[PDB]
Write a protein that holds these residues in place. Structure first.
Motif, short mmCIF file in Angstrom:
data_model
loop_
_atom_site.label_atom_id
_atom_site.label_comp_id
_atom_site.label_asym_id
_atom_site.label_seq_id
_atom_site.Cartn_x
_atom_site.Cartn_y
_atom_site.Cartn_z
N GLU A 143 0.81 -1.22 0.00
CA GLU A 143 0.00 0.00 0.00
C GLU A 143 0.85 1.27 0.00
OE1 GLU A 143 -2.32 -0.65 3.57
OE2 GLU A 143 -3.87 -1.70 2.44
N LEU A 159 -7.96 -6.83 7.83
CA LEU A 159 -8.01 -5.38 7.93
C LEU A 159 -8.65 -5.03 9.26
CD1 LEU A 159 -7.61 -2.61 6.44
CD2 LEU A 159 -10.04 -2.77 5.86
N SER A 187 -10.77 -2.65 10.67
CA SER A 187 -11.67 -1.73 10.00
C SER A 187 -11.67 -0.35 10.64
CB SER A 187 -13.07 -2.31 10.02
OG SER A 187 -13.98 -1.42 9.41
N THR A 227 -6.53 3.89 11.53
CA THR A 227 -5.43 4.55 10.85
C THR A 227 -4.35 4.88 11.87
OG1 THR A 227 -6.44 6.75 11.12
CG2 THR A 227 -6.91 5.58 9.06
N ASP A 244 -2.81 2.59 7.23
CA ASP A 244 -3.92 1.84 7.81
C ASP A 244 -3.38 0.62 8.55
OD1 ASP A 244 -3.35 0.24 5.63
OD2 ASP A 244 -5.13 0.83 4.50
N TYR A 289 -3.61 -3.66 9.81
CA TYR A 289 -4.04 -5.04 9.75
C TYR A 289 -3.72 -5.69 11.07
CZ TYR A 289 -4.58 -4.32 4.79
OH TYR A 289 -5.01 -3.87 3.57
N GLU A 349 0.92 -2.10 11.25
CA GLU A 349 0.53 -0.84 10.68
C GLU A 349 1.17 -0.69 9.32
OE1 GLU A 349 0.84 0.67 15.24
OE2 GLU A 349 1.05 2.21 13.67
N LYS A 408 1.01 3.83 4.10
CA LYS A 408 0.60 4.40 2.82
C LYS A 408 1.58 5.49 2.41
#
Length: 330
Positions: free
Chosen positions: A47, A69, A71, A74, A88, A90, A107, A110
């Motif tokens: 990502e 994930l 949900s 962040t 984001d 997992y 973590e 991104k």
């Protein structure tokens, strides 16, 4: 349970240390910077903005059958050196040196700042400070150590960093062959989320020991030793030609110098940092001005016992109900 993993300097200066970590099923092995000064386990990933990846190994959660994930979660972190990352989250299985945690927050980056991109050897960080500093929102997550703790034979981990050589992180046991003499334990404040303790003083070279309380943090993720300006001035005054350079960003010294040792107190015990540990080499390639490994903490707001100090010791991070820190010579 226990775990034991080798940690390896990323370069010839010991700028940082990397430790292999298995993430996911089948395992994806990433080399992470174990950081007792922060509390996020974050990784370069599939990502991560493509232009911000330059040689790092990435975690690909879609290839892990145990990744889920988290949900809505962040994260975003900024480090003392001005670097940063965000993304984001997992949960997945994470193993270090044979010790496995299921459901660990991993973590996924991104975005990462330039210093991370530019360091091809570090695939992410594994935070080992207290979970109160973890940046995941809206539900804060636990560190690897916090998650493992109840399963460990003893609720501890140890850092045994090498000088220009590999070392070891152990979880759940104290290797009594890894140090000389005794381990001296000292009180920790967790109020700021760090392994914060108070050194009892210092000496420069063969000089007399100065008894003085120095509050600071044991931080494996910081390269250098950052201490009050008074202490740092006293050290560099013993090196002919050393000076603080505003243009370079700290104390520099002639590369022809022989550096004195630096001793710090742990209770009544003493840890000696050999002079060579304080040499961080030419400020730029081919320069005869060398960068010092002891620098002022003035304007950091905290003293930092980084790798320069910690690698002179066997260090116990005791995560008992009342945490403490132990230091032994080695």
């Amino acid at each position: 349970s226990t775990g034991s993993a080798t940690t390896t300097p990323i370069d010839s200066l010991d700028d940082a240390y990397i430790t292999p970590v298995q993430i996911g099923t089948p395992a994806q092995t990433l080399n992470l910077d174990f950081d007792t000064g922060s509390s996020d386990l974050w990784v370069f990933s599939s990502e991560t903005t493509a232009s911000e990846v330059d040689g790092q190994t990435i975690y690909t959660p879609s290839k892990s059958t145990t990744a889920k994930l988290l949900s809505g979660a962040t994260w975003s972190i900024s480090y003392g050196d001005g670097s940063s990352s965000s993304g984001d989250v997992y949960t997945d299985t994470v193993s270090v040196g044979g010790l496995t945690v299921t459901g660990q927050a991993v973590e996924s980056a991104k975005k990462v700042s330039s210093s991370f991109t530019e360091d091809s050897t570090i695939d992410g960080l594994l935070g080992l400070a207290f979970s109160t500093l973890n940046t995941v929102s809206p539900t804060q997550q636990k560190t690897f150590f916090d998650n493992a703790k109840a399963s460990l034979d003893s609720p501890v981990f140890t850092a045994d960093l090498g000088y220009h050589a590999p070392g070891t992180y152990n979880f759940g046991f104290i290797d009594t062959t890894a140090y000389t003499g005794s381990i001296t334990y000292t009180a920790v404040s967790t109020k700021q989320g760090f392994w914060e303790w108070t050194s009892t003083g210092y000496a420069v070279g063969s000089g007399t020991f100065k008894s003085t309380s120095i509050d600071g943090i044991a931080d494996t993720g910081t390269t250098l030793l950052y201490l009050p300006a008074t202490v740092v001035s006293a050290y560099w005054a013993q090196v002919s030609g050393a000076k603080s350079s505003s243009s370079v960003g700290g104390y520099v010294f002639p590369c022809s110098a022989t550096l004195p040792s630096f001793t710090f107190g742990v209770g009544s015990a003493r840890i000696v940092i050999p002079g060579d540990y304080i040499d961080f080499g030419p400020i730029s390639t081919g320069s005869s001005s060398c960068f010092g490994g002891i620098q002022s903490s003035a304007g950091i707001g905290i003293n930092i016992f980084g790798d320069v100090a910690l690698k002179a010791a066997f260090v116990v991070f005791n995560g008992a109900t009342t945490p403490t820190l132990g230091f032994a010579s080695k």
